[PDB]
Structures are given as structure tokens and as C-alpha cells.
Chains A and B, each alone.
Chain A
Amino acid sequence: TGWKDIPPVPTAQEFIDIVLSRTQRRLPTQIRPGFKISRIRAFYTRKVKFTQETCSEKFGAIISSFPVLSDQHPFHRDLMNILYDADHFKVALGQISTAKNLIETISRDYVRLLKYAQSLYQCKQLKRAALGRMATLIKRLKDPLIYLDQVRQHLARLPDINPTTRTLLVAGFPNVGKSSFVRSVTRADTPVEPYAFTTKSLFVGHLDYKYLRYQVIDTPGILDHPLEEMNTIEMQSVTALAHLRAAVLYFMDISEQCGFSLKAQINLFKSIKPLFANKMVFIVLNKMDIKKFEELDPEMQQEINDLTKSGEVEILRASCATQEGVQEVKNHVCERLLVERVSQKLKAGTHSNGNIGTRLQEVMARIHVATPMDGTTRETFIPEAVKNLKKYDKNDPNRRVLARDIEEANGGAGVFNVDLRKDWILENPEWKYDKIPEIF
């Protein structure tokens, strides 16, 4: 569902201040030398144990709130590795855990020392020593706290990508129209600017196609390099293109108005097809209104066609400024994804044994419509006023009055008093609002 529920991670000074303020403010702080040595020992031992407990809770809360990278989906694990340097992330969490254990050991040692203390001064010195040691360990855990707070904030701002749903991954070089298409098909605010790398992260939008919800992932943008010197941005791009089963929309600009050569575009597509091993690939040609496909030399034209003549990569054309083919390309890709998913669900339901699954039986029952055997229908008593009516809209000047508007004018929801006799259809209209006798 997200990672916005991770509690804020304090700095070292804030951590020390919180722990010490709690240990002084939630406990009594007046012991006298004239009290029993056992009572003095109990007082100081209680102070040492409280400080440690507050610490272990806040350390355990930190350790348990942050996601564990192993148990996440491969996409999430790889994206977190790209974004936060997973190894150093784990090192920081391990330091938090080791500090927790060391503070626990300090508490046990000083509790035994307070057990065998003999004076109020000695007990005071032992308590001060234990508290100062804990503060020293936190002051050591200064920097990991800063790093973890930054990771927590970034994680709370990260988008929600469900790895296994109906997904449309729009990818390609910068300056091609990826974000333009994303805002055309979804209401996600993806920055659109004339420069090169305006999209510095993965963006998520959503759409509805034949009563189904579809995810659309805008990738930042990939350059034509071998995969070993790619930046973290295009590494997020390739991670999304690698671990997300979906329909890939690879965008190209036939016009060189993007700033990269067509030959390099086909080269990168060939390079990242092994990424696109089975996920369904549609090549979208954009800025046709700047230069359509026909206005191109035929060696490039046959190069594109030879790209088509392999697997099931499909060519479509569109323009994200005139809004010409965006609806058609969306419709086509969503329809093909839907039919593929329905076919694979049917094959999964039809097992080798031949026994029809319970859920497939249920869906067959839900799609089956039963009709009378005789084939005769029933008479329908729909009046004529309904087809003589006008559909209600909240924006028409001379609309219908409506009881909401009447009560809002004559008070509110708890103040308007309804006349239950206003619709009484009697013989004489003046007999309304009459007190009908009940007892005589």
C-alpha cells in the first residue's frame, strides 16, 4: 500500500534529548541520602532500565518500520537498490541493531553494579556512567540516522506500483513524447519541458478501459550505452522494463527533433529487446505532424519494417500535440493486453487433468445468461413521461428545484421540517393539514 507509515527517524541529538527527557519526566526524580540503601538502589536501577527500554523501542521501531529488501518483489528490491544503495542501507540498519544490543548490555552490567553499590554517591555515579555511555553510542549513530531519515522521506514520496496488474510501460529516449502521452491518457502530473531529462523518476497514472483499471508507468528515458555505465535514472527505467510484465510502448521520433539519431533509436531497441523478451512490444511513432512516416527514405522504412518482422512487435503512429492517434493506440494496446490476459487465465483454469476449476466454474456461471425456454417475454409497463423527460444536470440554469435545494434554502439537514402532507392527494385540496380524530 506504500511506505508512508514509517515513523520519522530522529537525529542523534534529538534521539538523546527524547530518551533523556522521558527518563527524567516520566519518573520521580527526588531521592534522599537518608533513605534505605535498597530504596536508593531501586531508584537508580529503575532509571537505568527505563532509559534502555525507551531506546530499544525506538531502535526496534526503526528496524521494523523500514522495508526488508529480501521480502519485496524483485522490482521493488532493485529500485530500492538503485535509489538508496541497498548494501549501505543494510549497513546502517545493522549499526542500529548493534547499538541496540550494546545499550542492552550496558543496562544489564550497570544494573548488577547498582545491585552491589553501597552509597548514594556510588549509585549516582553508576547511573550517570550508564546514561553517558548510551548517549555516546547514539552520538556515534549520528550519520546513519540522517541517511535513514532521507531514505524514509523518499520512500514516503515514492509512487505505488503494483507489480502484477494490467500495466502499460512507456519508455524510450528523452524528447519523444512519453510524458505528453502519459498526461493525455491519465491525470498524473508528469512535467513536460523542452529540455532532455525533465523526468528524473518513474511516474504512475491510471485509466479505465472497458470497466477495467489500467496502470501507466512513465519511465524517465534511456540512452544508447551498454548497460554497465547507465545512470541511476535510466537504471530505474531498465528496472521497470525488466521486472514488470506489461505492454511496453517504445516511443520513437522519426524526425530527429528529439536530438538522437534514428539509427541509434533502432539500435537501442535491439539492445533492450532481451529485456522485452515476452512482454508485449508496441513501437509508437510520434510527432508525425512534424514529419509523417511516408516522408522518409525507404532504407529506414524497410529497417523499421524488418524490426516489425520479428516476434509480435507492432507499429503504431500518433501525435501528442494534435491528439490524433492517442485514443486509438491506447485502445489497441489495452485490448490486446486484455485478450492475452483472458486467454492465459482460461488456459490456467483448464488444467491438464481436464477437471474444471471452481473459480472457472464460478465465472462461467456469472457470464451465463438464462432465458425462458418458450422464448416469450413479459409486458413492460414503462410510461411515456419518462421518454418525454429531460435528464437532470447540476449545471443547467433553469433546472428542477429539488428537495436538497429546498432544505438548503429553508435551513439545513437538521433544521428543515418536512411537510408530509404536501403530496396528500385528497378529494378537496383544503382537507390537507387537518387533525384526523383517532380516539373518541
Chain B
Amino acid sequence: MPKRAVSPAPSENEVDIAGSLFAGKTVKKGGGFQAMGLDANLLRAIARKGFSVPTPIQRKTIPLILERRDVVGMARTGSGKTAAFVIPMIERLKAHSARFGARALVLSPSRELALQTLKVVKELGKGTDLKTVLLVGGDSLEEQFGLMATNPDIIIATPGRFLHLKVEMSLDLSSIKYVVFDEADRLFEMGFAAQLTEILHALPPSRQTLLFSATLPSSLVEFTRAGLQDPVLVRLDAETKVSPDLESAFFSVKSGEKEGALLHILYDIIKMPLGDPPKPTEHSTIIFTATKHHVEYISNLLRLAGFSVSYVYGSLDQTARKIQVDNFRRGRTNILVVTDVAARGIDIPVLANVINYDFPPQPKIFVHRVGRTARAGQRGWAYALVRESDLPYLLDLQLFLGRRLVLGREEKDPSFARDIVVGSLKRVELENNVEWVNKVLHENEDIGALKRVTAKAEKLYMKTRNPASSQSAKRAREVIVSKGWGQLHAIFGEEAANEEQVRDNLLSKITGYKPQETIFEINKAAEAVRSFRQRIGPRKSFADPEVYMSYTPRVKMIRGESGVKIAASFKSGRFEKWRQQHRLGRLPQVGEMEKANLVRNFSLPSGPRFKHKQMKAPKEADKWRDDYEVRKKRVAEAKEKR
């Protein structure tokens, strides 16, 4: 049944920077934490953890937060978002409050994200008396009662679990003053939008809100516009600015030769060594694809070819995700294949090679994936495979980047770093790799099934992908008509061009042949063909540079833990039943002093949380059973233990 049961796990990564439409006895500007004036205990907390120099995310966000302005942050993973908003946690709270109530709330999509947030919280709150709690599904809900009675000041939670507990408690959230949505992009991708909206309704209007993400989907933009009070939107320096040290090449290749082209670009241009390699490696190539099935197929094909390959797709097991990313960061692998969202999730080192197997729908997505590399002044290479169907997207990219686009070898020395160069690959070994792919597909059945699955996925993506613009389509048509579409690429050598324009002239003369009559003309069918051919027969600076006006710029249902649709407010009464078991009194109303008796009753275990807890008495001893006496002793001991 689950062959594309719900949908391809990596759907798309939509992004929109139009969210930016929201708006010597005097140490001089040392860009320091002490320069922003954090308290002494916090400063010693930094001194122990070892972040000596603030990341740009911290430098641009912490002072605005200290000024108490609503914040929407854009950064790629590993930039320092979590520290960037968790330093304000303790910097603002400064102490535990005896009065009942929570004051800081952090909402994270997944349990592992909640856990990493929990560690950043604890090793920054080392020293303070602030109480921090974690609320995720799968934990003991009675223990969650106990922690809520233990009265944390900071609550890090998964929105569904927090919603269920809030409905079970009738929590008064008016005491909460700080709200963080950590990776709300993945929140909306996972579809917690209704839960987040009603939680936002539940929270009081007087709060300070941060939303941290890598991208800004339109749904997230609308949510921020509806729920944030004058949000300041911050970028991590230059993601849109393409690195000048990046040199790009575009290869016109066919659907039946995509795999051959990828093998060619790895073997001949990138000169990739085979086998296990003897902090990234010297080669360090990433491959961006469209679908998880594409990732599977390409990873398996490259592994058959003998390359050191790691794969990360959207709905991958988290342990395997950690394993693959660890191998990539430690240099045990050279190929890293991701679609878009796995790459967004993982923290990518500096890379030397970026290969676009499937051309992006958005020039913005392209800019993201290529800004992944060529950072800190290091040179980088970006090779992209383009089809005739992907050509309008390439022209949209050309318009977006404002770069001159050269076809084949119209220029003797086109600038790979400043110009968008499109060309073809060497036919001889391109056909060699294509024959290799055909042979391996015809031999191995598993890879053949993978090819069929990824072909069906490609059809689905073609049906569901955002189309390009009319002018881009027309320019695609005209450049296809033009000669440069089929010419050899510039990187392959002027001598190679010598043989190419020696031989291809009459090959072009073959290709551009117009038959006088078809085979059917060589009956009613023949008459219809002749008439239809006859019908289709061919049809016979004055601008003031200063002030010329230009045309162009410059009961509600919610999904519960069981997965069945459930009413938003469903008080099952198990909190009532909870204090019925525990014989507890009225829970402390918001603002009253905490009860040390309640804390001692339900505070926490003695450290590590061990999942396995199951006490059964052993079966009754049988006289005819061999170990009768010892089993009787065990049963008696269990009875004494009760």
C-alpha cells in the first residue's frame, strides 16, 4: 500500500525574501558579550562554554531582543540561532520567581530539536535557579503533571503535546512573557499551523516573540504578519549575494543521459578518486536532487560505481541522519546527495563542488544551494544539468542574477565566475557512461525498480512543480532554435572545439534536413497526410538616461497523538483522575508561592532517565518445575516487595 501513500516526503522548499517587506580609556566597539553588557554570571557561563566571538546571528539579534523588539531571523543551520535566543532567556529572567506561573515558552517541531534546545538552556543556565522543563510526546504524561506542579519558568515543548497538556490543565498563560518559534518553517511543513494559531490566541497579547528559520514560506509570512507586533526581519549577512569565487557551468543533457552526465562530471572534470578516502576532503561534492526516490537511485548507482557516498533525504531515520552527516563532516565520504530539505536541516561544511542534478524551480533555491559553498573566500565550482524543460528556469535564473548568458562557445574565453555558460558534454565518453548505465540497469533488478520508481516520482514532480514565466518560455524556445544549445561546452578545450566544428558541420547538415515527402507518401491516409502537410507548409537608444520612466523596478478538529481527528477542546478528565490517584489538593493558582511538599512529591528522578520500567511478580512456582525452591523464594520476595 505505501507506495507514495500520502506524498513524496520532500515536497518543496519554498522561500520568499519579500518577507523583508515587513519594514585607550574607551574600548571602542569590540563586538563583545561584555560590550553588550550581560550579567556577570552569564558572562562566566560564556567563559566556560567557549563561544569567544559572537556569530553574526547573535550580533544582529541579541541587542534587538534586549531592546525588546519582535524578531524574525533568517539563518542556515549551525549559525547559532539556539544560543542567539536562549541567551536572552536567562538574561531577561535573571532569577526564579516564587509566584506560580511560567514566563518563557519555546516551541520546537521535533523531540531532538527540543533536546538540543534543552542542552543549550542548561549549559547556559548553569548557576541560575531558573526551572526549565521539556514537553514532548512519548514521555510519561503523569510526569508531565508533576513537572507542571514543579513550576518551571521556561517551557520547551512540541506544539501538539503542549496543546494537549494546556487543554488538560486549563493553563493560565497570561504569566508567559516570552515566546519563541524555533524552526517554524518545519513547523508549517509538518502541519502544526492550526495548533500554533490557537496557541497564539491562548497566549496574552503582551509578549515578546521571536521566530527563527532558514526560509520564509508564504504561510509563515502570513502567520508572522497576523501574530507579530512590528517584526524586525534579520538576515545572516549575504545569502542572496552570490560569491564571486564561484564558477558555474551548465550542461545541456537529456533525460536518458542524466545519469551518464553525472558520472561524466564526477569522473572527468571533478577527477573523483574511487574507494574509501584514506574537516572535509579535497573534493567535497554535494548533489542536489528533487525527490527522495532520486536520492535513493543516485546514491545506489554511485555506490555501484564505487564512490564514497552518503545520502540524506527528508523522512530519514534520525540516527541514520546523524551517521551520514557525521561521515560527511569527518571526511569518510565525498558524495553527499540531498534533495532540498535534508540539506536545509543539516549543517553543511565548506564545499568544493556543488552539482545540481535536477534544476531548481526557483532561482532563490539555486542561490541558496550555491551559497552553501564558496564561503570565506574559498573558490568553488557549481555544475548544473539542464534539460529543454528546465531551460526556462535557467533563463529565469539568468534574469534574477543579472548575468550575461553564453551558449556553447560563442566566446573564446567566457567568464565562468561572471557569465552563465551553457554547453554540451563530450559525446564519446558521455555515450560510454550512458552505455554503462544501460548495462547496469539491465543487469541489476533492484536498481531497475529504483529507476522505475524515480521515473514515476519525476512525472509527479513535473505535474506538481511551479511553472516559469511566459518570457522565459519564449526565450527558451528561441535559444533552442539557436545553434548554441547543441554546441560543446567551453571547459573542454579549444582543440576539442577544433575537431568539433570540423566534424559537426555536416552532422548539423543532417540534423537540419527537411524531407520532401514522408514514407507514407513513398490511399485516404496518404491524401490526408498530403493535405495536412500542405496546410502546415511554411508561412510566407532614444531614451534620456536620467529621467526615462522604465517599465521594470529600478467545533474545530485537531490531529491528536493517536492520529484520529479530535476536537480542539477535549477535556478527558484525566487530570481530575490524576489528583484522584495522588490525593493532591488544589493546584497552586498562578501567582501563589510554590509548595515544597508538592515539589518533593513530584520533582524529578536522580538524573538519567531510563526508559524501561516494568515490575511483574514471577509466575507461581511448580513442584514439577526444576527450579521450584528458588522460584518459590523469588515469589515470596516479590510478595514482600509488594
Bound Cα distance from A142 to B522, whole angstroms:
22
User: A146 an interface residue at 8 Å Cβ cutoff?
Assistant: yes
Q: Which residues of chain B are within 8 angstroms of A83 by Cβ–Cβ distance?
A: 518-519
User: A375 an interface residue at 8 Å Cβ cutoff?
Assistant: no
Q: Which residues of chain A are within 8 angstroms of B506 by Cβ–Cβ distance?
A: 227, 274-275
Q: Which residues of chain B are within 8 angstroms of A72 by Cβ–Cβ distance?
A: 254, 256
- Determine whether the beta carbon of B431 is less than 8 Å from that of A274: no
A142-B503 contact given A84-B518, A357-B274, A359-B306, CB 8 Å threshold: no
- Determine whether the beta carbon of A71 is less than 8 Å from that of B255: yes
Q: Which residues of chain A are within 8 angstroms of B529 by Cβ–Cβ distance?
A: 143, 146-147, 150
Interface residues of B in 480-514 (CB under 8 A from A): 502-503, 506-507, 509-511, 513-514
From B67-75, B213-221, B224-232, B432-440, give the one contacting chain A: B432-440
- Determine whether the beta carbon of A355 is less than 8 Å from that of B503: no
Cβ-defined partner of A143 (8 Å) among B306, B516, B528: B528
Interface residues of A in 74-112 (CB under 8 A from B): 74, 78, 81-85, 87-88, 91-92
Q: Which residues of chain A are within 8 angstroms of B515 by Cβ–Cβ distance?
A: 81-82, 85, 232, 235
- Determine whether the beta carbon of B274 is less than 8 Å from that of A70: no
By beta carbon, the residue of chain A nearest B438 is A164
Bound Cα distance from A83 to B628, whole angstroms:
91
User: B533 an interface residue at 8 Å Cβ cutoff?
Assistant: yes
- Determine whether the beta carbon of A85 is less than 8 Å from that of B518: yes
User: B419 an interface residue at 8 Å Cβ cutoff?
Assistant: no
- Determine whether the beta carbon of A274 is less than 8 Å from that of B503: yes
- Determine whether the beta carbon of B435 is less than 8 Å from that of A164: yes
Bound Cα distance from A78 to B510, whole angstroms:
8
Bound Cα distance from A213 to B245, whole angstroms:
50
How far apart are A150's CB and chain B's nearest CB, in angstroms?
5
Interface residues on B, range: 35 or more
Cβ-defined partner of A232 (8 Å) among B273, B275, B507, B522: B522
Q: Which residues of chain B are within 8 angstroms of A351 by Cβ–Cβ distance?
A: 267, 271, 274
Interface residues of A in 118-159 (CB under 8 A from B): 142-144, 146-147, 149-150, 154
User: B520 an interface residue at 8 Å Cβ cutoff?
Assistant: yes
A235-B513 contact given A143-B531, A146-B525, A163-B431, CB 8 Å threshold: yes
Q: Which residues of chain B are within 8 angstroms of A277 by Cβ–Cβ distance?
A: 503
User: B388 an interface residue at 8 Å Cβ cutoff?
Assistant: yes
- Determine whether the beta carbon of A352 is less than 8 Å from that of B271: yes
Bound Cα distance from A242 to B507, whole angstroms:
7
1/0 contact trace for A37-79 toward B, CB 8 Å? 0000000000000000000000000000000001111100010
Q: Which residues of chain A are within 8 angstroms of B519 by Cβ–Cβ distance?
A: 83-84, 154, 232
Interface residues of B in 254-289 (CB under 8 A from A): 254-256, 267, 271, 273-275
By beta carbon, the residue of chain B nearest A77 is B511
1/0 contact trace for B85-123 toward A, CB 8 Å? 000000000000000000000000000000000000000
A81-B431 contact given A73-B256, A143-B532, A275-B506, CB 8 Å threshold: no
By beta carbon, the residue of chain A nearest B532 is A143
User: B429 an interface residue at 8 Å Cβ cutoff?
Assistant: yes
User: B536 an interface residue at 8 Å Cβ cutoff?
Assistant: yes
Q: Which residues of chain B are within 8 angstroms of A154 by Cβ–Cβ distance?
A: 519-520
How far apart are B256's CB and chain A's nearest CB, in angstroms?
5
User: A353 an interface residue at 8 Å Cβ cutoff?
Assistant: yes
How far apart are A294's CB and chain B's nearest CB, in angstroms?
36
Q: Which residues of chain A are within 8 angstroms of B531 by Cβ–Cβ distance?
A: 143
Bound Cα distance from A84 to B271, whole angstroms:
42
Bound Cα distance from A376 to B274, whole angstroms:
39
Q: Which residues of chain A are within 8 angstroms of B273 by Cβ–Cβ distance?
A: 353, 355
A164-B503 contact given A70-B254, A82-B515, A85-B533, CB 8 Å threshold: no
Bound Cα distance from A92 to B515, whole angstroms:
17
By beta carbon, the residue of chain B nearest A144 is B532
How far apart are B428's CB and chain A's nearest CB, in angstroms?
8
1/0 contact trace for A223-249 toward B, CB 8 Å? 000011000100100110010010000
How far apart are B365's CB and chain A's nearest CB, in angstroms?
24
How far apart are B277's CB and chain A's nearest CB, in angstroms?
11
Q: Which residues of chain B are within 8 angstroms of A82 by Cβ–Cβ distance?
A: 513, 515
How far apart are A349's CB and chain B's nearest CB, in angstroms?
10
Q: Which residues of chain B are within 8 angstroms of A238 by Cβ–Cβ distance?
A: 510
- Determine whether the beta carbon of A71 is less than 8 Å from that of B254: yes
Bound Cα distance from A232 to B514, whole angstroms:
10
Cβ-defined partner of B275 (8 Å) among A91, A235, A358: A358
By beta carbon, the residue of chain B nearest A353 is B273
Interface residues of B in 510-565 (CB under 8 A from A): 510-511, 513-520, 522, 524-525, 528-529, 531-533, 535-536
- Determine whether the beta carbon of A357 is less than 8 Å from that of B306: yes
Q: Which residues of chain A are within 8 angstroms of B510 by Cβ–Cβ distance?
A: 78, 227, 235, 238-239, 242
How far apart are B515's CB and chain A's nearest CB, in angstroms?
5
Q: Which residues of chain A are within 8 angstroms of B536 by Cβ–Cβ distance?
A: 88, 91
How far apart are B258's CB and chain A's nearest CB, in angstroms?
10
By beta carbon, the residue of chain A nearest B432 is A348
Q: Which residues of chain B are within 8 angstroms of A359 by Cβ–Cβ distance?
A: 306
Bound Cα distance from A91 to B534, whole angstroms:
13
Bound Cα distance from A143 to B522, whole angstroms:
18
Bound Cα distance from A83 to B275, whole angstroms:
47
Bound Cα distance from A275 to B507, whole angstroms:
8
1/0 contact trace for A385-403 toward B, CB 8 Å? 0000000000000000000
Q: Which residues of chain A are within 8 angstroms of B274 by Cβ–Cβ distance?
A: 351, 355, 357-358
A164-B511 contact given A147-B528, A359-B306, CB 8 Å threshold: no
Interface residues of B in 407-435 (CB under 8 A from A): 429, 431-432, 434-435
By beta carbon, the residue of chain B nearest A149 is B525
Q: Which residues of chain B are within 8 angstroms of A81 by Cβ–Cβ distance?
A: 511, 513, 515
Bound Cα distance from A74 to B305, whole angstroms:
26
A228-B435 contact given A146-B528, A358-B274, CB 8 Å threshold: no
- Determine whether the beta carbon of A164 is less than 8 Å from that of B431: yes
How far apart are B454's CB and chain A's nearest CB, in angstroms?
15
By beta carbon, the residue of chain A nearest B520 is A150
Q: Which residues of chain A are within 8 angstroms of B507 by Cβ–Cβ distance?
A: 242
Q: Which residues of chain B are within 8 angstroms of A73 by Cβ–Cβ distance?
A: 256
Interface residues of B in 304-345 (CB under 8 A from A): 305-306
Bound Cα distance from A91 to B388, whole angstroms:
17
Interface residues of A in 263-280 (CB under 8 A from B): 274-275, 277
Bound Cα distance from A317 to B536, whole angstroms:
50
Q: Which residues of chain B are within 8 angstroms of A146 by Cβ–Cβ distance?
A: 524-525, 528-529, 532
Interface residues of B in 611-634 (CB under 8 A from A): none
1/0 contact trace for A303-343 toward B, CB 8 Å? 00000000000000000000000000000000000000000
Bound Cα distance from A328 to B518, whole angstroms:
40
How far apart are A237's CB and chain B's nearest CB, in angstroms?
11
Bound Cα distance from A154 to B306, whole angstroms:
42
Bound Cα distance from A164 to B432, whole angstroms:
8
How far apart are B121's CB and chain A's nearest CB, in angstroms?
48
By beta carbon, the residue of chain A nearest B267 is A351
- Chain B residues with CB under 8 Å of chain A are 254-256, 267, 271, 273-275, 305-306, 387-388, 429, 431-432, 434-435, 438, 502-503, 506-507, 509-511, 513-520, 522, 524-525, 528-529, 531-533, 535-536
Q: 25 A-B Cβ contacts within 8 A?
A: A72-B256, A74-B511, A81-B513, A82-B515, A85-B515, A88-B532, A91-B536, A92-B532, A143-B529, A144-B532, A146-B528, A147-B528, A147-B529, A150-B520, A150-B525, A150-B529, A232-B516, A232-B519, A235-B510, A242-B507, A245-B431, A277-B503, A351-B274, A357-B274, A359-B306
Knowing that A143-B532, A355-B275, A358-B305 touch, tell me 11 more A-B residue pairs with CB under 8 angstroms. A85-B518, A87-B514, A147-B529, A163-B431, A165-B435, A200-B522, A227-B510, A239-B510, A274-B506, A348-B429, A351-B274
The 4 closest A-B pairs by CB, nearest first: A358-B306, A164-B435, A143-B532, A146-B528
